[PDB]
């Protein structure tokens, strides 16, 4: 249960941790699985959407902020709007002032700098949203893992969500495999689909449950949904 030191975000535990941030990270854990991975020349996101009931819909867990970038969701939906809007503002500012497409690492730095100022000052709350930024710049394909704590790191692949982290082992066993795969988007997407399948517990993958995005040089950022994703099922 909540303790005395919960209060507001500006408060240190005697052990030396922020309970607000920890609660944000737990809410990150509670969300659905959105495993993603990248190759030398391609970046693939795989998302498992959730429906309230049979007569319901699915959340767009894949948000596009530019043609050379993309986003994934692992938590609170409304704050994802704010985060995506900020990322789009900075991408458009880069386009209009520098002409340079925003570097993926620079995007992660901006996102962490934004996420800080709620946890640093009174009146703010941490962004309980987990971004898996993908993109491709002149350097190469990149992938990040954003956290409400402000921690941002670049990885070949990861999975944030309910029992999603149980699907990291599939990536780790095949980490040496999908890295050396270049210019082969369909099979990389197939490997990603195999990765998420390990995180299934009750219901299998269907047409309306799989949302897939992929970016690259020859392949711009494209979101797959509906019948367009059944070929990879």
């Amino acid at each position: 249960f909540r303790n005395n030191y919960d209060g507001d975000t500006v408060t240190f535990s005697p052990t030396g941790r922020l309970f607000q941030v920890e609660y944000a990270l737990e809410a990150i854990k509670q969300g659905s699985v959105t495993v993603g991975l990248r190759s030398n020349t391609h970046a693939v996101l795989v998302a498992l959407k959730r429906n309230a009931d049979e007569l319901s819909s699915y959340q767009k867990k894949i948000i596009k902020c530019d043609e050379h970038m993309g986003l994934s969701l692992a938590g609170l939906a409304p704050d994802a709007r704010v985060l995506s809007n900020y990322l789009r503002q900075q991408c458009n500012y880069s386009s209009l002032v520098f002409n340079r497409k925003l570097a993926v690492e620079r995007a992660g730095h901006l996102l962490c700098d934004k996420a800080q100022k709620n946890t640093q000052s009174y009146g703010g709350r941490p962004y309980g949203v987990g971004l898996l930024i993908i993109g491709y710049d002149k350097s190469g394909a990149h992938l990040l893992e954003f956290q409400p704590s402000g921690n941002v790191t670049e990885l070949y692949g990861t999975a944030i969500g309910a029992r999603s982290q149980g699907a990291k082992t599939y990536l780790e066993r095949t980490l040496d495999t999908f890295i050396k795969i270049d210019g082969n988007p369909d099979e990389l997407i197939k490997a990603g689909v195999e990765a998420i399948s390990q995180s299934l517990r009750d219901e299998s993958l269907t047409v309306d449950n799989l949302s897939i995005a992929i970016v690259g040089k020859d392949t711009p950022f494209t979101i797959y949904d509906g019948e367009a994703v059944a070929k990879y099922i």
């Binding site: 500006v10 030396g16 640093q120 921690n151 670049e154």
Partner: protein, 243 residues
């Protein structure tokens, strides 16, 4: 009365602020990071811990650069140090804009310390939980300062924070005693690698990854850059030789 640690600006009966102490205790739960003040410049070093192998090697970095001659290496709450170094970069940019002289190291220290303490005066701001080993080379020479979350900074001849903070300082003292007249940067980088290896022995359970960087006048002529190529490997296997 109880609750003397709930708020920030409250003084304890013995006169010691309590949120700052908890921030200090949060600092120690961080990756070790040392810095050596060689004769011509400074040599930083970090021990970014390799998590599950999904993390890409040699890509995530922690030695942030300010201007050209000031380097920042931080431990503890990494994002908080990110924001601190961001404000420091803004201050250096303003100084160079309205003075057109590169910011001297003690001036940067004063600016960062004044910013840090500004966050431990109020009740509506959490004190920083990051300790920095920022330093570099200026006109008058070389300086290496460690900043603490209480806002106190000192002109160290070498410092280290992290899990292996205590072990690192012993080897720092041994290095200082072994070379009282001074130390060259070339040997300083190898000594820094050795010190980090000795400190990492506490965290031998998890894998390590070493990144090092140095600012100097003899070679880098006041420019800050990392260590790449055969020099890093030479330092690594020299430090592994004695093991």
């Amino acid at each position: 009365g109880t609750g003397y640690d709930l708020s920030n600006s409250v003084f304890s009966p013995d006169g010691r602020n309590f949120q700052v102490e908890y921030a200090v205790k949060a600092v120690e739960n961080g990756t070790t990071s040392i810095g050596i003040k060689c004769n011509d410049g400074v040599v930083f070093a970090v021990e970014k811990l390799i998590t599950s192998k999904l993390l890409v090697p040699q890509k995530n970095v922690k030695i942030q650069v300010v201007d050209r001659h000031i380097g920042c290496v931080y431990s503890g709450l990494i994002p908080d140090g990110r924001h601190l170094v961001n404000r420091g970069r803004e201050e250096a940019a303003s100084f160079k804009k309205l003075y057109k002289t590169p910011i001297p190291i003690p001036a940067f220290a004063d600016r960062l310390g004044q910013y840090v303490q500004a966050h431990t005066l109020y009740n509506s701001v959490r004190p920083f939980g990051v300790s920095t080993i920022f330093g570099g080379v200026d006109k008058n020479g070389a300086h290496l300062y460690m900043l603490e979350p209480s806002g106190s900074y000192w002109g160290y001849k070498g410092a280290a924070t992290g899990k292996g903070r205590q072990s690192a300082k012993a080897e720092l003292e041994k290095l200082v005693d072994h070379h009282p007249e001074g130390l060259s940067a070339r040997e300083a980088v190898k000594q820094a690698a050795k010190i980090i290896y000795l400190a990492h022995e506490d965290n031998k359970e998890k894998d390590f990854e070493l990144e090092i960087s140095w600012c100097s006048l003899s070679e880098t002529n006041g420019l800050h850059k990392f260590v790449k190529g055969d020099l890093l490997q030479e330092a690594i296997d020299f430090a592994q030789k004695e093991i």
